């Protein structure tokens, strides 16, 4: 909006801004290790203590 | 894959009424519907001054002073020719709604600029009759 | 409209001359000069910054 | 850098941007508010200016 | 020189006014950015105290 | 500029977005903006 | 279309200034902008024509072509209203100008810087401490006579015949006009362009017409020929010694008429008003901008 | 070879031939100095013509014109009222 003025000035006829905002896209990566030695026994079933 | 449009937004332009602020405590207001036909306005003051036994009346006149303010909104010839016509297809109705929203927003902007210029003229005429503090500390 | 710009006026002499019975109301100023035969030629002004 | 036979008193003006305070008493000024009438100034060839 | 708010975003975003390194015995010029966090007012206002 | 001038259901919020805006946008705080003054301040045709 | 410019005075106005301005209602006034409301500075021709001794008429012309034009209809205290003159509309312009030039039926009006004095066409506004002067509006032939009298006094200034040049003569009355001494660089630039035009005229002018008028002065006497006093000029003698050829004459006239249109447009300074149906009983004329 | 220039002005035709003579003041003596106008028809330094009016406020917003390969700068006068006129010679 503007202000109507008494003095003769160059009137800003209904200014309107259209701005945009791009997103910031960034990924996070952890690298968790897991040994296969305590993984191959995860498939079978125990029968001895 | 897709591009996402995370919502559009705009400011809701709040209309600021002259009495909705406390500047109107300074000024008593009257809707006078014919100020274009008011060429002049004056006020007589008969101030009766008493005396002290160990007679004057100071007739003073104050005159009003008009203040013409006007901005200039601008509307294209597109959203008037499409405004006066009648829409038929739903895309033309979605266009006609945008056109009438443009025109109504421009007109509401115009009266909003007038009701802001009113506060500007009030704030200016309250400066034009305002001597500074270091003078009226002694003069009063 | 309220944020107005009051402008004052400042003034200062440059290169004046004291009368001949000179003196000093100080202690910790010693100038390597004959004191009865010195006069200024420049004036030092502190800036805005 | 010798002294000339005359002195000068340098006058200058310094502008200070202040933050004023305006007071005004109650009912100091009676004012009449007119009517916001709308008009048409110019029919420029693509936009009309109200 | 160009812009003022974009100077502020240039100051804040990546901040390469060629700063020196840290935690070395003698300062080199840092090449890998945004690993050590720096802040360079001297690369903004070009003075020295 | 990546700004789309299309008409939109513009959601109206109440925050004072235009707090020292024109002197900000003329100096280019925003990465890509568009100023529409006068006859271009309308909704675009579909 | 609404053409109404209200000019709010920043102060009041006394009754004598009101009664002086109220006599000048209907007279043409220029404006600074073309907007809705305006302040009083920039109104009138007074910002370029200061309260000095030295005028400059061509700078007032360059002002007048630059600014817009309006007619004064309502003047009140603290505010006076004006009606703009935009091309495309048709206006009623009354003849309220004190040096009374009688207007032609459907002729052409022409605005003008005040040639008959500062104090003659002005209003003194001590209340707003400025001065509003009124540009003269006179018909186009008398305007051309005034303009050429000003330029002729500008060129004859290094020669001297004064009152034979410094006073316009109309059928209603003959009038004196204010004669300055130097128009500065702008009037001299106008004279420079007109000097280019005149010198290129005396380059490309034909010779058969001189051969006509040399024998014609010797043949006939006319009111077009009495000013030579029956003495052919010596340049006619020392140019007419050559022969006559129609092909180079048609080549010369194809640049003569090409340059005379631009020379005619070298006198269109100041905007021009095209009038119609001027009644001599009500002193108004239905006129529009040309 | 001749040139086709375009001039935007907020003044009158009486002003525009004077200020265009002043603008072309080096070019006339350039063309005179390299080539003497040996005949009578080479005196004309072209002509001008009013193409019409437009608003002095939002006039002449700069833009670009893209072909398939390149792009040149081009002015964009908006809301033009076209009104041609006859040729007024410059000299």
Swiss-Prot record, chain C:
Q: How does it assemble?
A: Homomultimer. Makes the hexons and eleven out of twelve pentons. Interacts with triplex proteins 1/TRX1 and 2/TRX2; adjacent capsomers are linked together in groups of three by triplexes, heterotrimeric complexes composed of one molecule of TRX1 and two molecules of TRX2. Interacts with scaffold protein; this interaction allows efficient MCP transport to the host nucleus. Interacts with capsid vertex component 2/CVC2. Interacts with the small capsomere-interacting protein/SCP.
Q: Which family does it belong to?
A: Belongs to the herpesviridae major capsid protein family.
Q: Which residues form a coiled coil?
A: none
Q: What is this protein called?
A: Major capsid protein
Report the locations given in the UniProt record. Virion; Host nucleus
What this chain does, per the entry, is described as: Self-assembles to form an icosahedral capsid with a T=16 symmetry, about 200 nm in diameter, and consisting of 150 hexons and 12 pentons (total of 162 capsomers). Hexons form the edges and faces of the capsid and are each composed of six MCP molecules. In contrast, one penton is found at each of the 12 vertices. Eleven of the pentons are MCP pentamers, while the last vertex is occupied by the portal complex.
UniProtKB/Swiss-Prot annotation, chain G:
- GO CC terms: host cell nucleus; viral capsid
Its keywords, alphabetically, are: Capsid protein, Host nucleus, Virion
Q: Where in the cell is it found?
A: Virion; Host nucleus
- Keyword match RNA-binding: no
Q: Which InterPro entries match?
A: Herpes_capsid_2
Report the SS bond pairs: none
Q: Which GO terms describe its molecular function?
A: structural molecule activity
Q: Does the keyword DNA-binding apply?
A: no
How the protein assembles, per its UniProt entry? Interacts with TRX1 and major capisd protein/MCP.
User: By its UniProt entry, which HAMAP family does this protein fall under?
Assistant: HSV_TRX2
Q: Which family does it belong to?
A: Belongs to the herpesviridae TRX2 protein family.
| Biological role | Structural component of the T=16 icosahedral capsid. The capsid is composed of pentamers and hexamers of major capsid protein/MCP, which are linked together by heterotrimers called triplexes. These triplexes are formed by a single molecule of triplex protein 1/TRX1 and two copies of triplex protein 2/TRX2. Additionally, TRX1 is required for efficient transport of TRX2 to the nucleus, which is the site of capsid assembly.
Q: What is this protein called?
A: Triplex capsid protein 2
Write the lineage as a comma-separated list: Viruses, Duplodnaviria, Heunggongvirae, Peploviricota, Herviviricetes
UniProtKB/Swiss-Prot annotation, chain H:
Principal location: virion
Any coiled-coil regions, as ranges: none
Keywords (A to Z) from UniProt = Capsid protein, Host nucleus, Virion
GO MF, one term, reads: DNA binding
**Where does the protein end up?**
Virion; Host nucleus
- The domain of life for this entry's organism is Viruses
One term under GO cellular component: host cell nucleus
Q: Which GO terms describe its biological process?
A: viral capsid assembly
Family statement? Belongs to the herpesviridae TRX1 protein family.
Function, as annotated, reads: Structural component of the T=16 icosahedral capsid. The capsid is composed of pentamers and hexamers of major capsid protein/MCP, which are linked together by heterotrimers called triplexes. These triplexes are formed by a single molecule of triplex protein 1/TRX1 and two copies of triplex protein 2/TRX2. Additionally, TRX1 is required for efficient transport of TRX2 to the nucleus, which is the site of capsid assembly.
Q: How does it assemble?
A: Interacts with TRX2, MCP and capsid vertex component 2/CVC2.
Q: State the protein's name.
A: Triplex capsid protein 1
Instruction: Give the residues of the full protein shown.
Output: 274 to 364 of 364
